[PDB]
Amino acid sequence: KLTASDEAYLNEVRQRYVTPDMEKWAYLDYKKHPSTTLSHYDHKSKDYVESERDDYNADVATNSHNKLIDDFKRNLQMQRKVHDILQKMDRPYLRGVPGVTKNISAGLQDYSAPVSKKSQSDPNDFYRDAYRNENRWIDQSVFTPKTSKMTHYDVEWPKELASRPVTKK
């Protein structure tokens, strides 16, 4: 049997393991290797220029971006699984003796007498929520934030960069 107080505590504590839904915060678009759009990059093309450094760096950048996206997705899935496990796990301490292994029946009591509102820049209050062990999977996942595209950078620059002349010799 679960008391109403226990049910309320469970409801308010299961909200600590809700995924942030990072899919709406990142551009999950894979980069295309320049061989797909430039003839001189493709090996099978008849106008292929064999350059070890240029192709090396191009493929390195493409693979890095793709790996970042893939590990972002994998970490998101792992975080979802961990949050589900934490929500669905049993909590034996709720059946302990109040005042020894559980909060007193009266509940949390504030014995202070504050006179002014607390500042919003409290370091402990910020940190205790900002940095948590159970969120490690999504805390260190690199992503490209969703921002409005700029023509000079996201449209014009790639065009001029790709239209560079190429020399066989």
């Binding site: 002014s116 500042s119 919003q120 820049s121």
Partner: protein
Amino acid sequence: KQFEERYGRAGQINISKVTYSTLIDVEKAVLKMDRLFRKVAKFENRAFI
């Protein structure tokens, strides 16, 4: 401005009334000194301007 409107302000600044008054006085004095410098520079550079 939008962020401040949405989330209020961080808090209140703990300052002394003496420091407050001295800051206002220093602002007024700086403005007066700027006006004096502008007038003096205008007088000096009249011939060239």
